[PDB]
Amino acid sequence: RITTPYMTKYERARVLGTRALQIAMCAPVMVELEGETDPLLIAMKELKARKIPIIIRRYLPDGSYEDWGVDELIIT
Amino acid sequence: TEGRSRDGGLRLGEMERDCLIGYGASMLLLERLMISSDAFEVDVCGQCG
Amino acid sequence: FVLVEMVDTVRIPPWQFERKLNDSIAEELNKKLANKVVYNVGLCICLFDITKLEDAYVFPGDGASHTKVHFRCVVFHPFLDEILIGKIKGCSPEGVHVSLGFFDDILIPPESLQQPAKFDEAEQVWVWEYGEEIRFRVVDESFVDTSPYTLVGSISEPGLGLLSWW
Amino acid sequence: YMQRRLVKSLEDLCSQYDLTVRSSTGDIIQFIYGGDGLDPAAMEGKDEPLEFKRVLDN
Amino acid sequence: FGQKDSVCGVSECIIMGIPMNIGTGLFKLLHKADRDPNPPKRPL
Amino acid sequence: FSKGEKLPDVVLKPPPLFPDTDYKPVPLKTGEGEEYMLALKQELRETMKRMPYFIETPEERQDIERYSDWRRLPREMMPRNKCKKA
Amino acid sequence: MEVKDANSALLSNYEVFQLLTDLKEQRKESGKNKHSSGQQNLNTITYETLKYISKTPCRHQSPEIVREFLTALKSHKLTKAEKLQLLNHRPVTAVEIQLMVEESEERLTEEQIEALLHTVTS
Amino acid sequence: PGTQMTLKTFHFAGVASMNITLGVPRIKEIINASKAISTPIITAQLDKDDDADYARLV
Amino acid sequence: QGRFRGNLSGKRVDFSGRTVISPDPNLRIDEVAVPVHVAKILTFPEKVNKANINFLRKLVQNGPEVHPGANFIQQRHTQMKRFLKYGNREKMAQELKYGDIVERHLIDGDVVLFNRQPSLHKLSIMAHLARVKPHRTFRFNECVCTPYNADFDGDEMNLHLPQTEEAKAEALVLMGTKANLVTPRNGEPLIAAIQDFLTGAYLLTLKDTFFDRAKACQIIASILVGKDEKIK
DNA sequence: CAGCGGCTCTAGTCTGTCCAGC
DNA sequence: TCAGACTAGAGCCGCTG
RNA sequence: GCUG
Ligand SMILES: [Zn+2]
């Protein structure tokens, strides 16, 4: 819980990138997409509704780790 | 290959590499400089290396 | 039969993300370790339980989910002290072939130890007389890959007497 | 030539989750980045994060 | 010297084709599957 | 091209060779002792056993090994016939 | 796929049979033709395996019997492998225990062997 | 910035004398960490700075 | 030219293009005009799934010669590629399965990398949303000339099409122009107004300017294009 | 009275000198 | 072409015994 | 050699 509450730009880019690849590979979409044919556009819509099934594991330099849910982290 | 006559393609130099590091773009640097150039597989023996 | 604790890195492809993991790993691990003898271990059959399933990574490539899975699977491995009951699915002149019922027709008994009326003379004579019992005697498995079977057994038949059938 | 040399030397440094700057081998260069932990691209003032006179008027 | 080289560094990651630790490589993602770890065991 | 034919030779034969089993008569005495002590050094107390076999065996059971005139008189003489150093 | 623990045997025939009977009837609930182009070796082993265990009349064999027979077995001093043989072999008559049964030498006594026939019959 | 430094002149450290390297050769001198450089300059503050008669002694 | 620098540190890449650049102020600052001749060549592998099956069918039907179209089709567990110039494409569209890969042409809204050849800082390479237009040059709004140090005097610039969904996201979120309005160095804006956008704004905002209702409306109505088309 | 040793000094040598296109 | 900061040498004198 |  020591690590920053705000999601970093690097974290957002990877979460969207993995989610888009998962959606492009026929994963379930939780946003009821309306007229979207591009996986990256669908992934960004999921992040806005805070419904992405991914947990970010933040590894401290010593080797200890803390897991933050994508929904829990504040998105700027 | 090297150029327009040979339908060569374009170079990601040592300076463009330095730009992409400063963005923290680890997967794009892997896509550009491995996957879309010279991706390969080797058999490695874990005993003798 | 014996339990064998095993550890595997089981990859669930991302179109199975509806189903629960511990079921959808089990559907994969049955397709990984059924009818396959593991060298120095025995003939795996199916999945007993998944004793510990740890956290589902997702790697920079595939986009799939790779959970390292500790489990227990039941395997077939006679303990060198078992009197089994099989069926003669074949008779060769060097020795009889017994088969456990629809289990594996790969148990090949050598025959030198039963009562001194022993020969198989190629007209399918079982034994010159005085379900079929078997004593599994040695473990013997050969790793197949060699260049750019595999659990065979040797099976005995001592002076059991065999009161019901000769 | 200068740019090649500087980048080769400094490419590794990364700001860590424990608010430290470490090399790849795990040695410390700085215990907190730049003394403040703050990002040069976010400075609304002359090397300072805010300008209070402007913010209160807004 | 028989030196062994840690493939951890940025430049050798680009040479070997593995994703660099800095940036988006510093953390790992877990899938939030509906799973039950340490599930009920079959009694012997 | 003069040698570009095959591996030089499977083996190179030296026209002169070893003399014999040299010192033939007397090493019958040492030669049996070569095999005598090796029969007794292996069957000695000063050896080790493969306890990794027994930790490998989960089949332990009963009835197997895995489960299971000096005619002399007293005297005492302690000589320092030897060195008085180190 | 490294096997961490090579062995751990207490799986009596009934246990494995029962697991297989629940498994066979449970796999078909979700039986899939998508995975047919992939794997089908599992079906064959389970199917045929059920029959060999079925040979032993574990049909009508009960879960409680495992403890009930075991409670009698601990007094006899036979080893765990021996008892598994005793349950799995299910010696129908004295001759198998009298002769076929393991560790006949010394421990037979013509006393507990006779008692075992009453226990095995139970 | 090294590509923006046109190797300008009109620089004399404020003393109409004492020419200095500046621009890219000065950055190059710093980051090389060479043990000797062109025109090394020590600035000495005088304690009794009141008048020129004390400066010319020291 | 040695392996360390020539073949390892910097290497030639595919799905890349180069052309003369020329201005276009009617594009947004995050957009770049890509000519049809480059767009028909630079393909992106779109994986077939429930959201795009009916869209990719129409692209497969158009085929290689019409711009919203496709050059190759690849079956689920196969690695050879069917060149879609031959065969009957209306049959190959019907036999699309989930998990097939359609190598569609570059279309509007693709994330595309855009780069001047000498790079002194990170803003010399940025990601832009492609829009296809007929003329041969690459075109972008002149507010983005200052990061690239471009001057439209026969200048050439490079284009790279990231071939992976993960490479789109890292390009779009981290390297997008809207995320890079300020230089990392001193934190000052580099994408801003330039000549004829400063002079026109200066002369407009001088005190001597007065407009009647007809000329007020005709200057303001210029902004009513694109996403501002719906606003009052 | 003689011998290490470091200093000190020649000078010797190998090592670089932007990105890319045609 | 222009250093350039390494690597041995040749000493040197003077204490160091 | 020239363009970038
Ligand atoms: Zn090897």
UniProtKB/Swiss-Prot annotation, chain B:
The effect annotated for residue 11 to H is: In CMT1I; affects RNA polymerase III assembly; no effect on nuclear localization
Organism for this UniProt entry: Homo sapiens
Mark the transmembrane ranges: none
Which positions does UniProt annotate for Zn(2+) binding?
45, 48
What subcellular locations does the record give? Nucleus; Cytoplasm, Cytosol
Give the protein's function. Answer: Catalytic core component of RNA polymerase III (Pol III), a DNA-dependent RNA polymerase which synthesizes small non-coding RNAs using the four ribonucleoside triphosphates as substrates. Synthesizes 5S rRNA, snRNAs, tRNAs and miRNAs from at least 500 distinct genomic loci. Pol III-mediated transcription cycle proceeds through transcription initiation, transcription elongation and transcription termination stages. During transcription initiation, Pol III is recruited to DNA promoters type I, II or III with the help of general transcription factors and other specific initiation factors.
Protein family: Belongs to the RNA polymerase beta chain family.
Annotated residues for binding of DNA template strand: 4-5, 11
Q: What is the name of the protein in this document?
A: DNA-directed RNA polymerase III subunit RPC2
Record's disease association: Leukodystrophy, hypomyelinating, 8, with or without oligodontia and/or hypogonadotropic hypogonadism: An autosomal recessive neurodegenerative disorder characterized by early childhood onset of cerebellar ataxia and mild intellectual disabilities associated with diffuse hypomyelination apparent on brain MRI. Variable features include oligodontia and/or hypogonadotropic hypogonadism.
Swiss-Prot record, chain C:
List GO BP terms, alphabetically.
Answer: defense response to virus; innate immune response; nucleobase-containing compound metabolic process; transcription by RNA polymerase III; transcription initiation at RNA polymerase III promoter
Report the main location listed first in the record.
nucleus
Which of UniProt's keywords are assigned here? Antiviral defense, DNA-directed RNA polymerase, Immunity, Innate immunity, Nucleus, Transcription
Gene Ontology MF annotations: DNA binding; DNA-directed RNA polymerase activity
Q: Which Pfam families does this one have?
A: RNA_pol_Rbc25, SHS2_Rpb7-N
Q: Does the keyword Cytoplasm apply?
A: no
GO CC annotation, single: intracellular membrane-bounded organelle
List the subcellular locations. Nucleus
Its subunit composition reads:
Component of the RNA polymerase III complex consisting of 17 subunits: a ten-subunit horseshoe-shaped catalytic core composed of POLR3A/RPC1, POLR3B/RPC2, POLR1C/RPAC1, POLR1D/RPAC2, POLR3K/RPC10, POLR2E/RPABC1, POLR2F/RPABC2, POLR2H/RPABC3, POLR2K/RPABC4 and POLR2L/RPABC5; a mobile stalk composed of two subunits POLR3H/RPC8 and CRCP/RPC9, protruding from the core and functioning primarily in transcription initiation; and additional subunits homologous to general transcription factors of the RNA polymerase II machinery, POLR3C/RPC3-POLR3F/RPC6-POLR3G/RPC7 heterotrimer required for transcription initiation and POLR3D/RPC4-POLR3E/RPC5 heterodimer involved in both transcription initiation and termination.
**Cited NCBIfam families:** rpoE
> Which family would the database say this protein is a member of?
Belongs to the eukaryotic RPB7/RPC8 RNA polymerase subunit family.
Name assigned to this protein: DNA-directed RNA polymerase III subunit RPC8
From Swiss-Prot, chain F:
User: Coiled-coil ranges per the record?
Assistant: none
Q: Which domain of life is it from?
A: Eukaryota
Q: What induces it?
A: Induced by NANOG and POU5F1/OCT4. Negatively regulated by the interaction of microRNA MIR1305 with 3 miRNA responsive elements (miREs) in its 3'-UTR. Transcriptionally regulated by MYC. down-regulated upon cell differentiation.
Q: In which tissues is it expressed?
A: Barely detectable in differentiated tissues. Expressed in embryonic stem cells and in other dividing cells, such as some tumor cell lines.
Where would you find the membrane-spanning parts of this chain? none
> Where located?
Nucleus; Cytoplasm
What is the annotated quaternary arrangement, including any partners? Component of the RNA polymerase III complex consisting of 17 subunits: a ten-subunit horseshoe-shaped catalytic core composed of POLR3A/RPC1, POLR3B/RPC2, POLR1C/RPAC1, POLR1D/RPAC2, POLR3K/RPC10, POLR2E/RPABC1, POLR2F/RPABC2, POLR2H/RPABC3, POLR2K/RPABC4 and POLR2L/RPABC5; a mobile stalk composed of two subunits POLR3H/RPC8 and CRCP/RPC9, protruding from the core and functioning primarily in transcription initiation; and additional subunits homologous to general transcription factors of the RNA polymerase II machinery, POLR3C/RPC3-POLR3F/RPC6-POLR3G/RPC7 heterotrimer required for transcription initiation and POLR3D/RPC4-POLR3E/RPC5 heterodimer involved in both transcription initiation and termination.
Homology family: Belongs to the eukaryotic RPC7 RNA polymerase subunit family.
What name goes with this protein?
DNA-directed RNA polymerase III subunit RPC7
Which species does this protein come from? Homo sapiens (Human)
Swiss-Prot record, chain I:
Q: What is this protein's tissue specificity according to the annotation? A: Expressed in the brain, in the cortex and the white matter (at protein level).
Write down which residues bear the modification named N6-acetyllysine: 97
Instruction: Report residues binding RNA.
Output: 116, 155
Domain of life from the UniProt record: Eukaryota
| Protein's cellular compartments | Nucleus; Cytoplasm, Cytosol
Residues bound to Mg(2+) 2 are 151, 153
- Annotated TM spans: none
Q: Tell me which residues bind DNA template strand.
A: 5, 12, 18
Q: Give the coiled coil ranges.
A: none
The residues listed in the UniProt record as binding Mg(2+) 1, with positions renumbered to this chain, are: 151, 153, 155
- Subunit architecture: Component of the RNA polymerase III (Pol III) (Pol III) complex consisting of 17 subunits: a ten-subunit catalytic core composed of POLR3A/RPC1, POLR3B/RPC2, POLR1C/RPAC1, POLR1D/RPAC2, POLR3K/RPC10, POLR2E/RPABC1, POLR2F/RPABC2, POLR2H/RPABC3, POLR2K/RPABC4 and POLR2L/RPABC5; a mobile stalk composed of two subunits POLR3H/RPC8 and CRCP/RPC9, protruding from the core and functioning primarily in transcription initiation; and additional subunits homologous to general transcription factors of the RNA polymerase II machinery, POLR3C/RPC3-POLR3F/RPC6-POLR3G/RPC7 heterotrimer required for transcription initiation and POLR3D/RPC4-POLR3E/RPC5 heterodimer involved in both transcription initiation and termination.
Q: Provide the family line.
A: Belongs to the RNA polymerase beta' chain family.
This chain belongs to which protein, by name? DNA-directed RNA polymerase III subunit RPC1
Q: What is the lineage of its organism?
A: Eukaryota, Metazoa, Chordata, Craniata, Vertebrata
Gene that encodes the chain: POLR3A
Q: Which residues of the full protein are shown?
A: 349 to 580 of 1390
